[model samples]
Target: SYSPILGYWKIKGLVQPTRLLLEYLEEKYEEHLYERDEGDKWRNKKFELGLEFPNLPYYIDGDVKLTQSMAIIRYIADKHNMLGGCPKERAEISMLEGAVLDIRYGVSRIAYSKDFETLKVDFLSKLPEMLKMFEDRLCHKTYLNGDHVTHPDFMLYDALDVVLYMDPMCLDAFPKLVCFKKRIEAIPQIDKYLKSSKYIAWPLQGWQATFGGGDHPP
Candidate 1:
């Protein structure tokens, strides 16, 4: 059972995680990307589609219509039985994913920042404490949800992918997470996606100095 996935022509922003899950599951879905010149087209089309809480990167699976990237990822993960072993475990997975969001916020503040030096200092100042949470959680397990890969794994992997791109040596202190990333990337589906053109190889935000690509706010 597959559906259509729609977004803009830009690189992976919020859509990447859901796409990763779909790819991992080998789900057949159409990626309806609105071209750069077609921004107006998507603006009109999204309203025409009648989304209740309208937003980019929405998914449609027959009657199931979803917006919000994290929700969409969870929806697909739940449908595929990838959440975790039980209800309690599923919630724990969600908890870890939420923590990933905190790390993502730290990254976004820097990536979208105009004052890189200031943001860099702030990020570095808080880096150890921030990574310590993940280091502690992931240090003991193969995946955040115990032995199996789960939703949070994909979410954090996507976040860390950008983190490493921005600063390759950022995770050198945390050997556990470095290996965890290797493990995730080594997954057959994920590894293939990482090498494919569809992968967002750099930070999507334009303010990034080294490897900025895709749409960014002016």
Candidate 2:
């Protein structure tokens, strides 16, 4: 069966991680995207959809209408047996995912705030330590939990993709993470999607990029 995945037009943003999982698992799905509006008015259509709680980056599988990016990712990964190796591994996966989420949030804080220069300085100041943690964690294992790719791998990889886009130099100090980023991205299915016409354009419009002050990679 197929499901509908909805989000903003021409950009990965919050939904790409879930879409990456679907690609990796070879799941059948379709995207419903909303175009940009001058008055910043995607909310009207979201309300029109009549979701219990309206939001973009939502997933509908069968009768389930799910919001929240991470929840959607977890549900799809769990359904596909891609979560982890075992219960203990699932615990580890959750822990690592939480850590990555925190890291992503740190970057987004700067990206979404009015105090761009100040926040960017603070973020860059602290980035090395966080990158070092991920480097050390990835140094010993092919995948975060072990040999098998788990849900967090996709999550972490996608998060790092944004960081790299923001400033490619961010990962230059962490060789392991740099290599890991390339390796995961080179996975046949992911590589294809990335290079395909379906791939979202760079600098997704509005809050997804300009939230900090101006376009990303600025």
Candidate 3:
């Protein structure tokens, strides 16, 4: 009789992929949005969340209290049997999951950088190489797990979508990756989530800090 509570900053940022997962699962959970105020806004509640790590994007579902976005996404995915079918499949899915994070993290770094213009160029310079790996990995597979959708599939969609925001044509040469994206977006759950009021389409990061933040666009 308990719905999970997902707490994170008001912006999309790291909580985004998990938001995608929760919506895809169609779970009705409480979303507590915190503001990046002068200081005490989140600080006051940080230690009170009963979270050992006490970080943003923490989740509490009944007895399960979790932190770290990946841990949380994996938890829900596993709970719903989305991770993988076997150990080998798990290893493959986990690798893609981690790889996608690396890409997402790099792009976020550029956004928060003092010199985002320069940093983003470098990010783009390496984009083709980075995306090509996923393109080749797709290797005619429907999802990251070949035939079944897995946890990383959500992250990959989120990550690639971020890249598109950064540079729309980033995926042009990687036709398979593009198809991979289209495939994920075509999911009924995701399609619905995108149109729902709960969906956040902009300010990919914190709005005040970077040019990249304006999923809302300044």
Candidate number with greatest lDDT: 3
User: Which tens-of-lDDT digit does each residue in 69-180 have in candidate 3?
Assistant: 8889899899998777899877877898878988989887778778888888988998788788888888977987778777788888988888887888888888898888
Q: What tens-digit string does per-residue lDDT give for candidate 2 at 1-218?
A: 66665555545566767777888887878887665442356655677765677676777766678778887889888887766668886787889988887777777656756576677777778878877888999877997877877777887887788777667799988999988888888889989888877776455324445542233345
lDDT of each: 0.73, 0.73, 0.82
List TM-scores for all candidates, in order.
0.85, 0.87, 0.92
What stretches of model 2 exceed 4 Å from their correct place? 38-41, 48-50, 204-218
Report the Cα lDDT for residue 211, model 1.
33
Q: After superposition, how far is residue 157 of candidate 3 from its true place, in Å?
A: 0.7
Q: Please say which candidate is ahead in TM-score: 1 or 3.
A: 3
Best by the TM-score measure: 3
Candidate 1: where are CA atoms >4 Å away? 84-87, 206-211, 214-218
Against the true structure, what is every candidate's RMSD? 3.2, 2.6, 1.8
Least accurate 10 contiguous residues by lDDT in model 3: 209-218
What global local distance difference test value does model 3 have?
0.82
